[PDB]
Design an enzyme around this catalytic site. Structure first.
Site, short mmCIF file in Angstrom:
data_model
loop_
_atom_site.label_atom_id
_atom_site.label_comp_id
_atom_site.label_asym_id
_atom_site.label_seq_id
_atom_site.Cartn_x
_atom_site.Cartn_y
_atom_site.Cartn_z
N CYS A 1 0.85 -1.18 0.00
CA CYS A 1 0.00 0.00 0.00
C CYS A 1 0.89 1.23 0.00
O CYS A 1 1.93 1.24 0.66
CB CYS A 1 -0.94 0.02 1.21
SG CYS A 1 -2.48 -0.89 0.92
N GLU B 1 0.97 -3.84 -5.66
CA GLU B 1 -0.23 -4.63 -5.43
C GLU B 1 -1.45 -3.86 -5.92
O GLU B 1 -1.52 -2.63 -5.80
CB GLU B 1 -0.33 -4.96 -3.94
CG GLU B 1 -1.38 -5.98 -3.54
CD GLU B 1 -1.29 -6.33 -2.06
OE1 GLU B 1 -0.15 -6.46 -1.55
OE2 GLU B 1 -2.34 -6.48 -1.40
#
Ligand SMILES: CCOc1cc(C)c(F)c(C(=O)NNS(=O)(=O)c2ccccc2)c1
Ligand code: NA
Ligand SMILES: [Zn+2]
Length: 268
Positions: free
Chosen positions: A140, A174
């Site tokens: 993140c 991601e």
């Protein structure tokens, strides 16, 4: 009733998403965060008292990058569990898709700070899995709204890729990415690939940048600089075409640059 407004440092910031602070904290109008240790608080009086008390003037962990007043701290989730959990709660206020807030031991966090006489002020961060089987060099990534669209996000993207170069691997963030994350990665990929072309196979662009071949091919497809031939993507660009593209609008803001010289890091 959830947290919808935070006071942190000298900023007040509206929330964008639900973040699972304890029920007692959420129910408050405003939450108050120490900008150094990331402790959150229900009242301004506790906030003001903590300010006079807090001896932290920077994030924990090791400073693995410092050029001028730009700084990155490496923080292990196993060794700074409470701190990294507060970070994830803070990050979930502005990230829709982040789901993992308390299980922070498998992650390492890279805290981006801007420094003055008062200390090292947090701008954003990215997390990263100690062992990423899917080959994702970012888990993140989050820039705080008052700092967004000013070069810090691009700095952090470039910084995640410098680490990927020191690990002799390629990586990719991601997914899914936030609206602004989509746009920031495509802008960075364009810039770096274009810059390298005017200065090359698809596989060598990959090994010079640590950008995966999928990320390279998709970016060159948006630039319309790739031919297909018998199942193979092939770069098809004239050096003049690269420059018509690189003097365009979005590539005229001078970046904050990652200077590998000033990067005091080594791979496990
Ligand atoms: C809630 C998430 O918050 C984010 C996340 C990411 C990944 C960001 F990149 C940013 C941001 O602020 N981007 N703008 S930029 O740094 O100036 C830039 C300029 C040129 C090229 C690429 C970026 C904010
Ligand atoms: Na705001
Ligand atoms: Zn504190």
């Amino acid at each position: 009733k959830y947290v919808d407004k935070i006071h942190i440092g000298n900023y007040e910031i509206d929330a964008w998403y639900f973040s699972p602070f304890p029920e007692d904290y959420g129910k408050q109008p405003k939450l108050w965060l120490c900008e150094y240790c990331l402790k959150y608080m229900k009242y301004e009086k506790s906030y003001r008292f903590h300010l006079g008390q807090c001896q932290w003037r920077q994030p924990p962990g090791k400073e693995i990058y410092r050029k001028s007043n730009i700084s990155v701290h490496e923080v292990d989730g196993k060794d700074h569990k409470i701190y990294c959990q507060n970070l994830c709660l803070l990050a979930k206020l502005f990230l829709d898709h982040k789901t993992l807030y308390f299980d922070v031991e498998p992650f390492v966090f890279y805290i981006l700070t801007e420094v003055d006489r008062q200390g090292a002020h947090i701008v954003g961060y990215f997390s990263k899995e100690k062992e990423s089987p899917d080959g994702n060099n970012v888990s993140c990534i989050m820039i705080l709204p008052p700092y967004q669209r000013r070069g810090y996000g691009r700095f952090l993207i470039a910084f995640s890729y410098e680490l990927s170069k020191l690990e002799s691997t390629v990586g990719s963030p991601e997914k899914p990415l936030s609206d602004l994350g989509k746009l920031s990665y495509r802008s960075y990929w364009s810039s770096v690939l274009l810059e390298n072309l005017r200065d090359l196979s698809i596989k060598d662009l990959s090994q010079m940048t640590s950008i995966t071949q999928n990320d390279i091919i998709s970016t060159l497809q948006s630039l319309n600089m790739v031919k297909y031939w018998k199942g193979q993507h092939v770069i098809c660009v004239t050096p003049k075409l690269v420059e018509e593209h690189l003097k365009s609008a979005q590539y005229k803001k001078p970046p904050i640059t990652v200077d590998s010289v000033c990067l005091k890091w080594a791979p496990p």
